[model samples]
Target: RVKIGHYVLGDTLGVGTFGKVKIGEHQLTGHKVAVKILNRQKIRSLDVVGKIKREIQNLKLFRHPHIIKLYQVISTPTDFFMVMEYVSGGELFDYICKHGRVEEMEARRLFQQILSAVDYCHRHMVVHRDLKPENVLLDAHMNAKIADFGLSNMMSDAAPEVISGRLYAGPEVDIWSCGVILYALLCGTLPFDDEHVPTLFKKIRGGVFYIPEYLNRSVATLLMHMLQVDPLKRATIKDIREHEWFKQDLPSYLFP
Candidate 1:
């Protein structure tokens, strides 16, 4: 039992820029948890104090079942250890990597759950600026849970510049990211990615990507609405929920 105060650290979970995550258990309750240890000097040196604090703050504010839970945070002058739920099924990225493209029905189920979680976040005025497959985790039963809110933006946050001084803003940025994820789920490849960063941005700005020929019109149409070049024209979460593809009456427990 590797001890860190009240918690006993276990095997390594993963690594981050300035630290690593490991499995941890409560010495008294035996509760399994994920421990993310961040180096204070590295965080301070990188001038990311506010960023880390905001990430912690964001995780604390969330109580949704489909969002990862932050149970506790312990800090010392030299380190910060975050105790979180141990999501055992790993990332959607690895899931997709193992299976080239998800079957339509399964994709719809996953997408619906993701949308439900994202809608919940949006309702709370939180925008997950980075909503890619890698950032989405899975539970033991393979249910999707949105993780990594490090880059999440509050609704009141300033818009970011994307391409050629164009200001990217609001839920629209998240909507666009969702569209990319949906496309990847359907096609098993990124919708917008080039060797050159600027070229990739150009492609993103142009909003030029082809949907597979086999995709049904309803699915294609919904994707088109989501991948619109102009954020102003992009489909809102309400719009997405009302779209033909998302109208199926799946079991209520599938989403939360």
Candidate 2:
């Protein structure tokens, strides 16, 4: 075992842009955890440092069961290391890849957890700019744990919509992302997966996505509102929570 702060570092889990993730064991609690080691040089800029620290602190404030927990943060002049909750079940994207288009019930289970975490974050005025399936981790029980807030922004800090023609609202970026995730869950494909960036943006701006004939009416309704091109007209957390699809008698414990 390699010594990393007060923990014993193990095998690498994955690598990121600025650093890498690995399994770690707390010397005191003997608890297994995930550790993110970020390179100092990558965050040399004052603006980047400030943003990264602020975002990490903001993540520490979260205490939801559905959100990945940040246990401890350590910093040195050379690098930054974060001790986080280790989820063995892995990414939601991995699960989707293994078992294509899951049934509506399973979709509901995953979607509900994502929504709960997102709704909580939104209520606290934190906007998760990145909300893709890859950012979501599953515990051993397959429970959703929203992870990665590197691009999160405070609601007040977000700029008002319209830097470009027909831009989706900044405050509602998470909502749009969720819509994409939901669509992918039910259809096993991204709603805007065009090869061309401009074409994809145009499709998203036009809210041009097809709902399969097999999808329930309630499902279609919810997706329609969430994918609305206009941020002002997009469905809010309240709207999603109150939708008929979410109101189904979904089991409390699913995918165990």
Candidate 3:
């Protein structure tokens, strides 16, 4: 779908399981954007309209430098269009796969930004259930934007089980996934990429991952603290903000 009073759609970005993302231009301002077009037929026949609405609703209320903004939803007889900010560089996963890996200091800084954005999301009453690198895109300046709200859930007063299963996700689950992402960022390979689905799922059971010894011990401790076996015992968002490792970066990082 074209933005209201905008020019015709341009080239296509790519399509996901649910929709196609295309490039578009604003007729007046000449601004460019990525428009996500989802098939109403797919959602209607699949009976997953609620899921679509929930994601859209959450996107409308959630805003941060890191979270991708979901602009106004344009609905037609056939499709639902979700307009979002466009990042030009590339997907984080592809960049890593192409380069093998990056320096630890770079990973440390970038990962901290990601964690800060994630902590903001947590505080705002949501959980990004899927936190893989594939869902992240970097701009030309290397700033990141956490995207793909399709799999996200709103936590706002949701019950514990519901939060974990459908809304605000439990703290440990995110920490564990973040651990996997961190591992990938440093090594460029996922330890659990093999075909053992059972084992892979089991790894989400908190404390299932660890930082390499090369990392500073105090910093590693914070990562470990976030990954408690019980969600209730997991390091809360407040604790993470107060972390010595994170606090150390406040002078430069706090502004962005």
Candidate 4:
């Protein structure tokens, strides 16, 4: 068995051109972790050394229940080993695909966790540029764990934003992405989806999408607020927290 630090590597969990992720078990505690092994040569060739290092740095600074924990990083001459929390249930994308639209209460539970994590990131002056079901992992207990802080953008620069070509790349962009995520959680489909790039952008810019009739009025209202066309009119994190649908049965621990 290959060993990275105190963890004995197990089966390969995933692989890519960058490298592979292996399931690892700590020798002393038997604690499981996902060990991401990135080949130094590959990262250098790909010109993503800075990206990887930034992600590592960001993860090291974050401590949140809903965020994936980075326990340690081990660097060698040839590779980089990142020992992280092992979430067995896989991506929330797969979960949503398998189960279709989740039940309202269950969706609320997951969204609350997601919102809490996003809020935490914004508070720390970080914007998770990439927010999607694919990036959100679920643990054995089916709890939401937001992963992939690698694409985070600091608040200092106002880059061209996603969805529309807005110049604000702050917390609002994340809020917009979260709105789309919430739509998918309840409807099992994206609000604005099109195969044609130009058409997709047009649709997104228009800020028009179908809201299924089965959705409750309160959630529908909240979604409208979140998916607003104008960023200025969009619902803020505080607005989302106070929304009627979002407030229902929300755990106190998530806010505190």
Candidate 5:
């Protein structure tokens, strides 16, 4: 029922447990924006409204360059609409498949780009619990931008062990998901390739560090440390940075 000149929010751009993203256009500006509209009924029924609100609160403090910029939103009686940066890189999976497998150097370059972004988020205590390639986006300049904050969470001012909930995912959840993305970035397939939930967690715990064809010893070593189930011993942001893989100027992307 909303109008932005030529195009209406005719179809959804994305859907989540709490909201749906709409394709929007500005009549005057002629610019596009992804509008996320949350259903109150769904929020109330799932009782995740508080979490959604918290994410919005956290988003205000989010100043990272690599993350999506949430500009503004209009809350109606029935839905909450948020305006976001529009990225139409298409499905990362499909893009990978269509482009065929990538070379080791190109893969490493992209992974470095993604990690640079994630490290920024982690610095602000935001754990992007979901880091699969689908959530990883390519902006207009073909740069990676982390999206779908629905599965993301803010860390408590306390310990990692204390934050485990049915959905409050552990701190390593981001790293674990990062590992998942890394494998896909290199192999064009997930590392564990778990079809079922039981198997997924099992593989996550058991740890599959490498596909030797793509991941050399150094890379595998780093990923193994990343997937460590022990939150206490898990690779911290600082730990990741100190790895030998970044001997060059991984520092350039790190600081402001």
Candidate 6:
């Protein structure tokens, strides 16, 4: 049995490029946690020291129901242990794959949680450069919890102008990614997908994707606004919050 601080480490939860995550339990209270074991050698060699530091710093600063909580950081000579909230419901990607095209009300529920988290991040002046189902974890209640802030950038650090003819990194990019996530949640497929790289980019840049016939006009219309080719013209978070479909059954606690 491996012990990190007051927690007893258990089985491996998952493995990533940097390291593996293990399930951990508090020795006294039996509280559960997901511990990320990052090897110091690998982080130094991969030149991701800054990335790891930034992720830890941002996670420590954020405190929202939909965002994963980082309880503690225990550093050793060989590894860096990040104790995070243990969410057993698994990734949203796996859930969408197993259950295909969630019911509208359920999808709306999940999307609202996601939007609230994203909005919270934006309000904090942080932009989650990567927002996808794979990065969204679910708790035992199946509620969405946004994770992985390694690629996130502070608003002040974000580039002010377009780079190489692209819109450049900003909160708008997160909105666009959320649009893709919304499409997947409702359609069980990506809005833009292709086996070929260039073709996929072209499809995305063209901002043309098929909306299923079963989808109502309200959601489809919202998707169109979010998926707009022009980032400037794309629907902002404010626009999304005001959209009728997004407003239905919205929890007041989410915005307030």
> Highest lDDT, which number?
6
Q: Candidate 6: minimum summed lDDT over ten consecutive residues — where?
A: 151-160
- Candidate 6 lDDT over residue span 65-167, tens digit each: 9988898898889999888888787778678878898888988999999989988888773434545557787888989987653221212221112222654
Candidate 1: segments with Cα more than 4 A from true spot: 4-7, 25-31, 125-129, 149-161, 193-202, 250-256
| Candidate of highest TM-score | 6
Off by over 4 Å in 3: 1-4, 27-30, 125-132, 149-169, 191-213, 229-233, 251-256
Relative to the true structure, candidate 2 reaches a TM of 0.82
Candidates in order, TM-scores: namely 0.82, 0.82, 0.75, 0.85, 0.78, 0.87
Q: All candidates' lDDT scores? A: 0.75, 0.74, 0.65, 0.80, 0.66, 0.80
Report the poorest 10 consecutive residues by lDDT, candidate 5.
151-160
lDDT of 1 by residue, 110-209 (tens): 8888887877776663534545556687888778888753222212211123454765564677777777778878888888878997788777777778
Ranking by lDDT: 6, 4, 1, 2, 5, 3
Q: Which of the two candidates, 2 or 6, achieves a greater lDDT against the reference?
A: 6
- Model 3 — TM-score against the truth? 0.75
Q: For candidate 5, write residues 69-186 as lDDT tens digits.
A: 8888667798887777787675555567677656766666666777777777656645344445567877787666778833222222212232334344444567666766666766
lDDT of 3 at 131: 55
Query: What lDDT is reached at residue 76 by model 2?
Result: 82
2 or 5, which is superior by TM-score? 2
Candidates 3 and 5 compared: the better one by lDDT is 5
Candidate 4: which pairs clash? Answer: none
The TM-score of candidate 5 is: 0.78
Q: Who is ahead in lDDT, 1 or 3?
A: 1
lDDT of 5 at 100: 63
Model 2 misplaced stretches (Cα beyond 4 Å) = 4-6, 26-31, 45-47, 125-128, 149-169, 250-256
Can you give the lDDT of residue 52 in candidate 4?
Answer: 74
Residue 169 of model 3 has an lDDT of 51
Better of 1 and 5 by lDDT: 1
Model 5 lDDT at residue 169: 49
